[PDB]
Amino acid sequence: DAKNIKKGPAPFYPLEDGTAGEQLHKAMKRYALVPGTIAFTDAHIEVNITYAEYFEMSVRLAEAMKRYGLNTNHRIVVCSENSLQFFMPVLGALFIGVAVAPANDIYNERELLNSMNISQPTVVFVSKKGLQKILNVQKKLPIIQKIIIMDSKTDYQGFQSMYTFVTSHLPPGFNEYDFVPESFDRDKTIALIMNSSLPKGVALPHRTACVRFSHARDPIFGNQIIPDTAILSVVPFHHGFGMFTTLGYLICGFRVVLMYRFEEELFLRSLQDYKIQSALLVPTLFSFFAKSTLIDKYDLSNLHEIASGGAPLSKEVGEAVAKRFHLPGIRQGYGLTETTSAILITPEGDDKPGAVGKVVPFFEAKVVDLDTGKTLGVNQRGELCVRGPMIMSGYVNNPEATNALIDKDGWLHSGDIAYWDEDEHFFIVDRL
Ligand SMILES: O=C(O)[C@H]1CSC(c2nc3ccc(N4CCCCCC4)cc3s2)=N1
Numbered sequence: 001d002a003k004n005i006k007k008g009p010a011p012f013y014p015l016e017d018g019t020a021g022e023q024l025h026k027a028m029k030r031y032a033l034v035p036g037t038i039a040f041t042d043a044h045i046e047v048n049i050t051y052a053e054y055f056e057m058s059v060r061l062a063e064a065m066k067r068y069g070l071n072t073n074h075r076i077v078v079c080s081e082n083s084l085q086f087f088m089p090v091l092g093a094l095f096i097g098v099a100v101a102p103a104n105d106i107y108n109e110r111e112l113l114n115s116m117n118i119s120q121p122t123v124v125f126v127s128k129k130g131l132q133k134i135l136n137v138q139k140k141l142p143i144i145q146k147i148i149i150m151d152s153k154t155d156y157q158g159f160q161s162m163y164t165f166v167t168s169h170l171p172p173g174f175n176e177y178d179f180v181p182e183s184f185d186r187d188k189t190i191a192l193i194m195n196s197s198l199p200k201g202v203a204l205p206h207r208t209a210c211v212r213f214s215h216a217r218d219p220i221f222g223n224q225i226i227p228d229t230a231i232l233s234v235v236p237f238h239h240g241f242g243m244f245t246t247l248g249y250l251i252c253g254f255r256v257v258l259m260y261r262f263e264e265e266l267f268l269r270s271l272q273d274y275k276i277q278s279a280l281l282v283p284t285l286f287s288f289f290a291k292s293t294l295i296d297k298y299d300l301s302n303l304h305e306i307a308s309g310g311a312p313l314s315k316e317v318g319e320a321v322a323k324r325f326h327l328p329g330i331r332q333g334y335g336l337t338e339t340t341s342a343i344l345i346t347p348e349g350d351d352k353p354g355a356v357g358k359v360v361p362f363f364e365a366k367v368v369d370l371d372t373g374k375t376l377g378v379n380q381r382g383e384l385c386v387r388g389p390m391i392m393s394g395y396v397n398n399p400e401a402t403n404a405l406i407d408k409d410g411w412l413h414s415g416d417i418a419y420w421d422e423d424e425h426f427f428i429v430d431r432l
Contacts, residue, residue, distance in 0.1 A: 001375045001377075003377070004366060004375045004376060004377040004378075005364055005365070005366045005375060006358070006359045006364065006365045006366065006420055006424050006426075007359060007363075007364050008358075008359040008360045008361040008362055008363045008364065008388070009220075009361055010361060011214045011215075011218055011221075011361040011362070012218050012219055012220065013214065013217070013218070014214075015210065015211065015214050015362075016210065016213070016214075018183070018186070018210075019094070019097065019181070019182070019183065019184055019186045019189065019191075019206045019210070020094055020186070020191050020206040020207075020209035020210050020213070020247075021062075021091075021094035021095040021096070021097065021181045021182065021191075021206070022181050022183065023210060023213055023251065024091060024094060024095070024247065024250060024251060025059075025095055025181040027250070027251045027252075027253065028051055028054065028055045028058070028091070028250060029055060029177070030253075031051035031052075031055070031253045032050075032051045032052040032054075032055035032056065032177075033052070034051075035050070035052060036050060037050055037051040037052070037253065038050055038051075038230075038255040039051045039053075039054040039250065039255070039256065040054070040084050040087075040255075040256050040257075040258060041230075041255060041256070041257040041258065041274065042083070042084050042258060042259075043232075043257055043258065043259040043266060043267075043270045043274075044259060044260075044261070044266070047084060049084050051253070054087070054088070054091075054250075055176070056176045057088050057162070057166075058087075058088050058091035058092045058095065059092075059095065059176045059179045060092075060166045060170060060174070060176060061088055061089055061091070061092030061093075061162060061165075061166060062091070062092040062093070062095035062096045062179070062181065063169070063170060063171075063174060063179060064092075064165055064166045064168070064169035064170055065092055065093065065096060065098060065123070065169075066096045066182075067169040067170070067171065068123075068146075068169050070093075070096070070098045070122060070123065071096070071097065071098065072097045072098070072099075072184065072189050074098050074099075074121075074122045074123075075098065075099045075100070075101055075119055075120060075121045075122065075193060076089060076093050076098055076099075076100055076101070076121050076122065076123045076124065076125065077100075077101050077102070077103050077116055077119060077121040077123075077124045077125070077126075077144075078090055078100055078101075078102045078103065078125045078126075078150075078238075079102070079103035079104075079105055079112070079124060079125070079126045079127070079130050079133075079134060080105050080125070080126060080127040080130065080150050080151070080237075081105040081106075081127060081129075081260045082233075082236065082237050082242070082258050082259070082260035083127065083150070083151060083258070083260065084258075085127075085150045085151050085162065086150070086237050087237070087246065087247075087250070088150070088162060089125040089148075089150070089162065090102070090247075091250075094191055094206075094209075095179075095181040095182065096181065096182045097182050097184045097189045097206075099189075099190040099191060099192065099193055099203075100191070100192050100193070101115070101116070101119035101121060101192070101193035101194075101195075101201070102192070102194070102237060102238035102243065103115050103116060103119075103195075103238060104195065104236070104238050105127065105129075105130055105238065108133075109133050109136055109137065111199070112133055112134070112137050113137050113140060113141070114198060114199060115195055115199060116137055116141055116144070117141060118193075118199075118200070118201035118396050118397070119193050119201055119396070120141075120143055121143070121144060122143060122144070122145055122146065123144075123145070123146045123147075123148065124138075124144050124146070124147050124148070125148045125149075125150050125162070126147060126148070126149065126150060127149070127150050127151050128149060128150075128151055128152065128156060131147070131149065131156075131157065131159070134147055135147070147159050148160055148161065148162055148165050149161045149162070150162060184206075186205060186206040186207045186210060187205055187206075187207050188205065189205060189206050190203045190204065190205055190206070190393070191204055191205060191206040191208070191209050192204040192209070192243065193396060194239070194240055194243070194337045195238070195239070195337070196337055196338070196395070197336070197337060200395045200396070200398055200401060201395060201396030201397075201398070202337050202338050202392045202395060202396075203392055203393045203394055203395070203396055204340055204390075204392055204393070205393050207389060208340040208341075208389065208390040208391070208392070209244065209247065209340070211340070211362055211388075211389045211390050212244045212247070212248060212340055212341045212390060213247070213248060213251045214361060214362070215248070215341070215342075215345070215360055215361065216244075216245075216247075216248025216249070216251055216252060217248070217251065217252050218361065219348065220347045220348055220350075221345050221347060221348075221360050221361060222248065222252075223249075223252060223254070223278065225252050225253065227253070228255070228275075229252070229253075229254045229255065229277055229278075230254065230255040230256075230257055230274050230275060230276050230277060230278075231245075231249055231254050231255065231256050231257065231276065231277070231278045231279075231280065232257045232258075232259075232267070232270055232271060232274065232276040232278075232279045232280065233245065233246065233249075233256055233257070233258055233280040234258075234259055234262060234267065234279075234280060234281055234282065234285060235280050235281070235282055235310070236282075239310070239337070240310075240335065240336075240337050240339075240340060240341060241280075241282075241309050241310040241341075242280075244340060244341040245280060245341075255274075257270055257274050257276060262285060262288075264288075264292060264294065265294070268292075268294060268295060268297075268298045269298065271298060271300055271303060272298040272299045272300060275302040276302060276303060277302055277303065277304045277305070278303075278304060278305045278306075278307060279303065279305070279306045279307065280307050281306065281307070281308060282310060282311070283308060283309075283310065283311040283312065283313050284311075286308060286313060286317050286318065286321050286330075287317055289321050289324060289325070290317045290320040290321055290324065292324065295324045295325060300325060300326070303325060303327065304327075305327065305331045305348075306321060306322070306325055306327060306330055306331065307330075307331045307332070307333070308330050308331070308332045308333070309332065309333045309334065309335070309342055310335075312428070312430055313330065313332055313356075314354075315353045315354035318330040318332070318353065318354075319353055328349070328351055329346075329351035329352070329353060330346075330351065331346045331348075331351060332345075332346050332351075332355070332356045332357060333345040333346060333356060333357050334356035334357065334426070334428060335390075336412075336414065337392075338391065338392045338405065338412060339386065339390055339391060339392070339412060340390035340391070340392070341390060342357070342360065343359070343360055343363050343365065343386050343388065343390070344356045344357040344358060344359060344360065344365065344426045345357035345358065345360050346358075352423075352425045354427055355421075355425035355426060355427055356426055356427070356428055357425070357426060358424050358425060358426065359386075359424070359426075360388075362388050362389050362390075363386055363387065363388030363389075363390070364386065364387050364388060365384070365385070365386045365387075365420075365426065366385050366386075367380060367381070367382040367383065367384060367385070367418050367419055367420065368382045368383050368385055369382050369383075370382050370383055370417075376419075378419075378420065378421065378422060379419050379420070379421055379422075380419060381417055381418070381419045381429055382417070382418075382419075383413060383414065383415070383416070383417065383418075384413075384414035384415075384416040384417065384418035384426075384428070385411045385412065385413050385414065386411070386412050386414065387409075387410050387411050387412065391406065391410070391412050416428055416429075416431075417429035417431055
């Protein structure tokens with residue numbers, strides 16, 4: 001061993017009661033009441049949407065879906081590239097306890113089928129450009145009984161938009177600010193079904209998102225709740241990195257600036273013009289910005305951190321990127337789809353080259369001997385194992401693949417090789 005088991009410190013605020021939908025509802029209502037509070041900004045088209053707008057459309061979607069008949073026995077799919085509308089049905093469903101399975105908007109038809117065959121959605125929200133794939137998947141999966149278009153105001157090609165669907169199902173005199181999100185068992189009600197790294201379905205109870213919201217506004221393990229904080233996120237919303245940072249930024253009242261096609265100039269200009277304080281990159285963009293020479297042309301003085309996750313960041317490209325951006329280091333974190341979000345996180349300003357962080361509040365982490373199972377001590381390399389309240393509840397209708405991952409005592413076996421050091425910073429070893 002127990003000197004060799006690394007434990008998450010204490011959360012700076014304790015763990016809120018209520019479902020993830022109740023916690024989102026309460027914060028967003030608060031932001032909704034101050035006019036002009038920006039929730040999302042689309043860098044390509046330059047449009048802002050406020051928390052008032054976001055809050056009111058999510059509450060209406062929640063009530064419409066409820067009046068349509070969806071409940072905890074149901075799942076919806078959200079199949080769209082990152083967009084201003086992406087999170088409206090996501091929030092709507094969380095408010096009423098309907099599980100959300102976000103679908104890779106660039107899966108081809110076959111991966112979409114396999115994804116939605118596991119998720120078995122009753123309703124699909126889709127962007128215009130994904131409709132024809134969903135219609136082909138629907139032919140094979142008639143459990144899809146209702147298709148709603150996300151990025152339209154009017155009806156589109158015979159299908160309702162979110163806005164016409166909402167009107168079709170709101171009671172007269174619906175009041176967005178009197179709406180009360182559903183109360184339910186957060187341990188037992190699934191919030192998200194996420195796709196596995198042939199893909200599997202990862203069920204995440206509302207609880208795992210609630211713990212994530214603790215980290216997100218933790219001053220050491222998340223971000224400080226400070227007005228006019230803006231984040232430029234270039235990560236897919238349909239995977240856990242983008243899903244659970246974005247929901248955390250919404251809980252925090254941040255301005256989330258998005259882009260879904262990378263462009264060097266647009267990214268750098270958006271950093272500058274939106275006075276971005278924190279940038280979110282997928283790791284292959286780190287290899288890009290190690291090569292970019294245009295960074296010094298831009299006023300990046302507001303930039304406090306560049307965050308990384310989800311894949312291997314080497315000590316080399318990280319140091320290269322930090323220098324091109326004149327930052328102390330890279331702020332990094334480690335988790336799996338099966339782990340909700342990041343379980344190891346660089347504490348703010350406690351950055352170390354090559355390390356992905358320390359054990360987050362509520363969790364524990366060890367490295368075990370690849371042959372026996374016994375717990376190792378400082379700087380010994382073995383398998384990375386973790387345990388805590390963000391671990392998935394299981395794979396959708398795949399119990400053997402679940403139990404091959406978590407022992408009877410609840411340790412998730414990362415399948416990664418790791419060590420921790422004298423300050424308890426963790427390091428992931430590339431097997432190659
Ligand atoms: O690679 C994966 O499978 C995915 C599963 S979810 C995940 C990560 N989620 C997150 C969520 C948050 C972060 N942070 C950015 C780094 C500094 C602040 C801590 C959160 C890093 C990661 S990495 N990576």
